[PDB]
Amino acid sequence: VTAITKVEREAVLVCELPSFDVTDVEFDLFRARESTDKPLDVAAAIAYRLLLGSGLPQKFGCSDEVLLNFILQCRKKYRNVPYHNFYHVVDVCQTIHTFLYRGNVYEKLTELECFVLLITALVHDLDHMGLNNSFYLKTESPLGILSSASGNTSVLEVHHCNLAVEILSDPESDVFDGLEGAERTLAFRSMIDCVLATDMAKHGSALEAFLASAADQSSDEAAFHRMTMEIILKAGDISNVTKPFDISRQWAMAVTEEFYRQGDMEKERGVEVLPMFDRSKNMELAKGQIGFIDFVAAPFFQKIVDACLQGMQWTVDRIKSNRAQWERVLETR
Numbered sequence: 001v002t003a004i005t006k007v008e009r010e011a012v013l014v015c016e017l018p019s020f021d022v023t024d025v026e027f028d029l030f031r032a033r034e035s036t037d038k039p040l041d042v043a044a045a046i047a048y049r050l051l052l053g054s055g056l057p058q059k060f061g062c063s064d065e066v067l068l069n070f071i072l073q074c075r076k077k078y079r080n081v082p083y084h085n086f087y088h089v090v091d092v093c094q095t096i097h098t099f100l101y102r103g104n105v106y107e108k109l110t111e112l113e114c115f116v117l118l119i120t121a122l123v124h125d126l127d128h129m130g131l132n133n134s135f136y137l138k139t140e141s142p143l144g145i146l147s148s149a150s151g152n153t154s155v156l157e158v159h160h161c162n163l164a165v166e167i168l169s170d171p172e173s174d175v176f177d178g179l180e181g182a183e184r185t186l187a188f189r190s191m192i193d194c195v196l197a198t199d200m201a202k203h204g205s206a207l208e209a210f211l212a213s214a215a216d217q218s219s220d221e222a223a224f225h226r227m228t229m230e231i232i233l234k235a236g237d238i239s240n241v242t243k244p245f246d247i248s249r250q251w252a253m254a255v256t257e258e259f260y261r262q263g264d265m266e267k268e269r270g271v272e273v274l275p276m277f278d279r280s281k282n283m284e285l286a287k288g289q290i291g292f293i294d295f296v297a298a299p300f301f302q303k304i305v306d307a308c309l310q311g312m313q314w315t316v317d318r319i320k321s322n323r324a325q326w327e328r329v330l331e332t333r
């Protein structure tokens, strides 16, 4: 429940981000982290600039100070893990900004829905420990038992939602405190629906529902809006392969190390270790990126672009050039 101090706020406000354009599709968060000995302050400043530059917080009665308090309460609940840390959720926030404003998806949503999506990026992985839903269920960890007894197998996504509600229950960090009645309800419900939809076990069914709503000129409007928000948070979450090859590769190194640490702990517990979680298989980075592109990311981006989101064509183009580059790594090995 512990309030953000003036000194914590000042450490973010001093960062000027010289030579960076946080609105650009080629923005490099790894270069921003290396540019300073306070990468946590720079990351918080990127999020702050993105939210104020949208012009949205101003319109919904969220002060500069409440916005920065929210950003810093989110930052305190991320852990020192290789991939699911504060840098991932700031990356997802920046990426969604590009999808809304460079890919023109803002045209499909209200200003409130655009504001909720940028805020939801920063809560969507709160208190991730670098272990996936499967780890908690296979090991019968206490959180796994609660999820099973409770009837919801989205172990981590329900936990993230719980900590988001906690942050927003204090007016000093409630970016939605300017709303009342149906607008306040829509902000909380849409945020929660979006976080729950990031569970990759629901990937196929969430994509098929969005594609069927987009094809139907008589789809319920409220339902189309909600599904568009869910698909944009999902797109940000699997956007690593849509970036400049070097940025893409650094993300792939970070996620591989997190997977390998999970596999190490599964060996110690004596439970099943999948091949891509096992250090001993020594599986090549190139073959793993090509597989992720072919079976997950290329069909996802191509289908949503063709169905509805024409302005995001650059994502399909960049996945194509990244696949070709991984093929040159194999051809020359």
Ligand SMILES: COc1ccc(C2=NN(C3CCCCCC3)C(=O)C2(C)C)cc1OCCCCOc1ccc(-c2nnn[nH]2)cc1
Pocket: 200, 237, 238, 240, 241, 248, 251, 252, 255, 276, 288, 289, 291, 292, 295, 296
């Ligand atoms: C920068 O890179 C990556 C970024 C994110 C991921 C993820 N991955 N996951 C998945 C975990 C388990 C796999 C299932 C999906 C979800 C996440 O939750 C997340 C964390 C989204 C992964 C990144 O690197 C990828 C490494 C090899 C993956 O390789 C493959 C191959 C083949 C098929 C495949 N074949 N047939 N059907 N699927 C899938 C994946």
Ligand SMILES: [Mg+2]
Pocket: 124, 125, 156, 198
């Ligand atoms: Mg997640």
Ligand SMILES: [Zn+2]
Pocket: 088, 092, 124, 125, 198, 237
């Ligand atoms: Zn995520």
